[PDB]
Structures are given as C-alpha cells and as structure tokens.
Design a binder for these strands. Structure first.
Lengths: 283, 91, 102
DNA sequence: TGCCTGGTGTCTTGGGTGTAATCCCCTTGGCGGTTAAAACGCGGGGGACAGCGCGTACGTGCGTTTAAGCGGTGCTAGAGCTGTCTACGACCAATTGAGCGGCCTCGGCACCGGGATTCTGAT
DNA sequence: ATCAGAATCCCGGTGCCGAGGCCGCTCAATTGGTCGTAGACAGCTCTAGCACCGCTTAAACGCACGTACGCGCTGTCCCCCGCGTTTTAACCGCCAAGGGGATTACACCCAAGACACCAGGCA
C-alpha cells in the first residue's frame, strides 16, 4: 500500500518541505522516494540539499456469482474478486449479456454471490444498455436504478482513451467500494487501432500496460476484472487466470468450456441467455 | 570499394620532399595513422557535442578536440592550419 | 518492457539513451533489453559483495568503503574497474612483509 | 378421371525472415633441400649476493605557533531555464570528375663480394 | 702505446620487383533548391561561489637525539657468456585440394471466401 509522505518528516525533513512535496502532488514516502531529486527540487522553496535529504531518508522508510449456478460450480462458486477472468468466445455468445448480468450480480450480497460493491462498465462497442441492467436487477431482485448508480460508465473510443479511463477508475474506485470492472470488446480497439504487422509489438505493449494497471487496481481494491475477447494474443495467457471458451448452442443456450486454469480442470458447462439474466441452461 | 588515404599522403609527400618515395609498408602505417587521428578527433568532438546537448559537430568542436588531444606546439600549429583552411574555404 | 523482460532496470529509458547517444542509425528491439539486463546484473554483483562487506563491518548501510572493498577483493570486478577511482573508497589493508619487525 | 418423389457436387496469394546450392582460390596440406639457426658442452670471469662497518639521515617525541576548519552572514556573478526566430544542415535529384583497380615499366634498394676502417683484448 | 684479428662499414656492380605513372570507369562528391529545427541571442531567476570575521584547536613546524638503514667495501662461488661443434627444422619453392567466403535460389503463418442443378407418365 501507500506510505504517506507524513512519515518523511520524522526522518528529519522539515515539515514545510513535506508540504511543498505534497503541493507537487507527491503524497507518500514511496512516491517521493522512487522519483529523482529534480522533481522535489523543482518545487518552489526547495533546494537540492533538502532534496538529497529527502531521497536518502525516504529510501530508509520505503467471490462474485456468475448467476449461472452450473457455471458457478464450474468456477467453484463464481468469479474470484481481485483477479482477472477472461471469457473468450464468438459474437452473439452473450458476452455483452454476461457483462450486463455481472454488472448487477456484483452488487448482490456476498452471501448471494455478489461482492457487495459497485460495478464498472467500460464500453468500447456501444452495446451498453441500462435497460438490460434493469432486467438483470429485477431478475436478482436488485434495484435497477441502484445498479446504474453502482455502475460508472464510459465508452472508450480508442486504446489511448481505453487506458485513460483507467486513470479515472483508479481515483474513483478509492472513493467508492467497487466489486466489478467490465471491459466489453476489450480487444477490439487493439485490432482497429493496431492493424499492422509491424504494430504487433505496439498493441502488445499497450495491452501489457493496460493489464498491469488492471492488476494493480485488482490488487488494490480486491475487485473482479472482467474483459471480453473475440478469438477469430499470447501475452494474455500469462495475464488471464481462467480462460473460458464460449460457443453458441442454437436458440439462446450457450456452451462454456474451460481452456485454462492452473488449478481448475478443463471442463464444460451449459448455460442459457434469458431475458432477465445470464442463467443456467434450462432445456 | 576499399578506401585509403594513400594518394593524398603521396601528394603531401611530394610537397615536402619532391624526390622522395615511400614503401608499401610505410604507406600502410601512414594510413593507419590518419585513420587513428581521425577517430580520436571525431570521437572527442562527438562527446563535446553530446556534453553540451548540441546535435551538430562544428569546426569549434573540432578545434577544442584538437586542443584536448594534441600536445603543445602540435596543437597550436594544427589549430592554425584548421582555422586558415576554414577561412580560405569560406570565401 | 521491463516487466515483460522480467527486469528491474528501465528498458524504455535504456532504449531512449541508445537512440539519442548516436551509436547507430537503427536499434533492435532486443538490444535495450539485453543491455538493461547486463547493467542490472553487474549492479547486483557489486551490491551483493558490498552488502557482504558492510555486514562484516557490522554496518547496515553500504558506504563507498564497502564498494571499494567489494571491488578490489574480487579479481574480475577489480579487473573490470582497473582504471577507476572509487571516491572515499580508501585502499585494501596491505603491508609488505619485509617492512614488519623481525 | 385422377394420380408423387426423387442427392451430391471443390479450390482458391499475400509480406518479411533462413536455408541450401553454388564456386573458386587461398588457406591448408605435403615434398625436398639447404643452410642458418638452435642445441649442447665447456671454461672462466665477472657479477650476484652475503657479510660487515659506519655515519648520517630519518623516525619519534615535545613545545610552540600557525592556519585550517566551522559557523554565520552578504552579495553578486553566472548557471540555468524559457521564448523566438533565423541561419544552417539534412535530404534529394542530376551531373561529372576525382579516385580506384588494373597494367606496365624503370630505378631504388637489396644482395653479393671485396677492401677499409673500427674496435677490442692481450701484451 | 701497440698490434693483430674479428666485426662492421663502405664502395661498386648486378638484378629485380615494387613504387610510380597512365588510363578506363563508376559512383560519390558537387550543385542547386527546399524545409524543418536547433542553436544563438535576449532576458529573467535564483543558486551558489566568493569574500569576510571570529573563535578554536588540531595540525604543522622546529628542534633534539638516538639509532636503523643506506651505502660502500670485500670475498666467494656460481652461472651466464662466448665460442666451437653437431643437429635440426625454418625457410624457399612447388605443387593439390578443399573449404569457406561471397553469390544466387527457396517455407511458415492468418487470411475466409464461395451456390449450383430439373427430372419424369401411368391405368
């Protein structure tokens, strides 16, 4: 966690210099410490000697239910909060529907398979429907209005906007308790933006940074991170903890397969897409 | 192809000693010499430009590099020749 | 890229320094990774030995003296830094045998 | 006058990196002589090395003095940063002449030989 | 001082092969124009380098004295030099061959697309 910069004054930095460091926007001893001298020196009323004293003394101090029961059993009860679970599958498999369902189930009591936290829906595809959220909320008997109140929503127009929303997510997730972060068509902007072959490393780098920010937020807030992937990157293998393959069974009933878990078996479960919900298959 | 300073060394030789020749081995040593001093001066000039956050190597960097690398009278005469050459060239 | 390479030293920064140091017109993707890894390793070897010296001296903080002891007491580091001066390092204790009393 | 029921078929590049086939001449390999250099033996002399004496220069200690160090204060020169803009260097296409590879020849140098001079060591 | 002998230097002759020059060619430097940008200059800030005063005290300094070490001298013996004799292998020249350095010819991956084709008479 953080090591608030207050602790730096006990090292014998005078408090005025700490206030100037806070003015710069450095608020922890960790924050000042792993930065060079010039950042603290550039602050008004701070010399190089005080900065050397600061750096030297600073180094001294520094399960959400899927709502398909059969799928929950496949997952041993639902998504583990604090980790990334990847569901890769074809279009029309219900990925957007699953996102809408989870956006509400996260708000469920933990004893009901929720995280008792607010939800975060980052859309890149325009498919965000508050009315679908209302349907899922009424399914689980949650207030649809409260679902929208526990879902902060923003549509990312590009990869840069996609990463920029993470900055708002990190500061906003501190102020309110969240349990779910949704990124729908998470890989589409990496395909439309990064379309070249020479750009493979570029999309991989942007994705890597995006994933690292995701991991930091997951470890920071203990929330579930849900991203959706269409498989028509090898970087995701190390990053996803649980890989789910989704394929259509005709009508509204979908087949789920586990394609990676270091602990969980490779296995499959059948579920359906119902007006209210993403919910177990009911032949 | 494969470059050397041989013809220029020979022209200079003809300037200072009109009736004197030079062996193949000796010419090889002169070529080694010119390349060596080129590398020393160019390298120092490169560092001079870098230290001062300049992207251009100018005659001033060459001159300073010469002052750093050459001893005493060699340095003074070399500086004189470079300056003279640049002045003759400019007009 | 540092995380991708499993490193602590900054690959991006090393890449930038390679680009702006006028070493070559082009720089491969693996070059700054390799360089960063080497710099990190050597840093680790010197810090390992210097830490050892610091503890031998019952000190918890590494000072230049410990760096000098670490470097000069290690044949290969001593070789690598043969023409290098460590400020405030001092020298290894060493008295020629002929100078000692009989 | 008023009636149904029948399956089975193909064939299609693009971009940007690693491999063997090609090939030729020098690097590697051997033979043969011949001669200069290396190997070996030996005598001896001179140089390394150990021992000894001495005298003087340097280490040690002490009283004096000198200035380095530290701490505060003052100010101004100049390092450092920012803004602007223009000169200057990258870049690019057409031209061409300087520079390089190849060929040829003659003169500087090298090899040989023989006399002169130098130099060394024994007398 | 002298003198003989061994080594080197010098002087001249002959040869030979590499340096110097010439010529074809080709590609790299030059010229002319354009454009972005970098660095030259102005100006402002504010850091730190220089200057100073005063007090303290630890370091420098001058000197006395004793003695350990540098240095000169002497003897010894051993081991390196220098020279004669034998051996050997480096060196010169010539030939064979092959191997690797430089040049030309050859897969693996993701990409999805694309519809056609009517026939057959009885009681």
């Amino acid at each position: 966690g953080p090591q608030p910069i207050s602790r730096l004054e006990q090292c014998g930095i005078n408090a005025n210099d700490v206030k100037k460091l806070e003015e710069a926007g450095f608020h922890t001893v960790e924050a000042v410490a792993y930065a060079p001298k010039k950042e603290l020196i550039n602050i008004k009323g701070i010399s190089e000697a005080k900065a050397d004293k600061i750096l030297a003394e600073a180094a001294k101090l520094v399960q959400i239910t899927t709502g398909s029961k059969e799928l929950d059993k496949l997952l041993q009860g639902g998504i583990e909060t604090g980790s990334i679970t990847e569901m890769f599958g074809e279009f029309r498999t219900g990925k957007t529907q699953i996102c809408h369902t989870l956006a509400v189930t996260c708000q469920l009591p933990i004893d009901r398979g929720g995280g008792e936290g607010k939800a975060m829906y980052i859309d890149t595809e325009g498919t965000f429907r508050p009315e679908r959220l209302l349907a899922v909320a009424e399914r689980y008997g949650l207030s649809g209005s409260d679902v929208l109140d526990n879902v902060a929503y923003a549509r990312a127009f590009n990869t840069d906007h996609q990463t920029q929303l993470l900055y708002q997510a990190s500061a906003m997730m501190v102020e309110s308790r969240y349990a779910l972060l949704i990124v729908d068509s998470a890989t589409a902007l990496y395909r439309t933006d990064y379309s070249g072959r020479g750009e493979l490393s570029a999309r991989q780098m942007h994705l890597a940074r995006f994933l690292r920010m995701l991991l930091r937020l997951a470890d920071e807030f203990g929330v579930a991170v849900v991203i959706t992937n269409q498989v028509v990157g090898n970087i995701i293998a190390h990053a996803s903890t649980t890989r789910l393959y989704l394929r259509k069974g005709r009508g509204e009933t979908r087949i789920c397969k586990i394609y990676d878990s270091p602990c969980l078996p490779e296995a499959e479960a059948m579920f359906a897409i119902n007006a209210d919900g993403v919910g177990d298959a009911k032949d | 192809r494969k470059e050397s300073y041989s013809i220029y060394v020979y022209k200079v030789l003809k300037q200072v000693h009109p009736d004197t020749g030079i062996s193949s081995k000796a010419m090889g040593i002169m070529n080694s010499f010119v390349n060596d001093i080129f590398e020393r001066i160019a390298g120092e000039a490169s560092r001079l430009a870098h230290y001062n956050k300049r992207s251009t190597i100018t005659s001033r960097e060459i001159q300073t590099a010469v002052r750093l690398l050459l001893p005493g009278e060699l340095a003074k005469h070399a500086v004189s020749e470079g300056t003279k050459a640049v002045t003759k060239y400019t007009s | 890229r540092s995380s991708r390479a499993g490193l602590q030293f900054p690959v991006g920064r090393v890449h930038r320094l390679l680009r702006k140091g006028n070493y070559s017109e082009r720089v491969g993707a693996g070059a700054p990774v390799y360089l960063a890894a080497v710099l990190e390793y050597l840093t680790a070897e010197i810090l390992e030995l210097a830490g050892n010296a610091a503890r031998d001296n019952k000190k918890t903080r590494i000072i230049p003296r410990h760096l000098q002891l670490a470097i000069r007491n290690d044949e290969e580091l001593n070789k690598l830094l043969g023409r290098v001066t460590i400020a405030q390092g001092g020298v290894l204790p060493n008295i020629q045998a002929v100078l000692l009393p009989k």
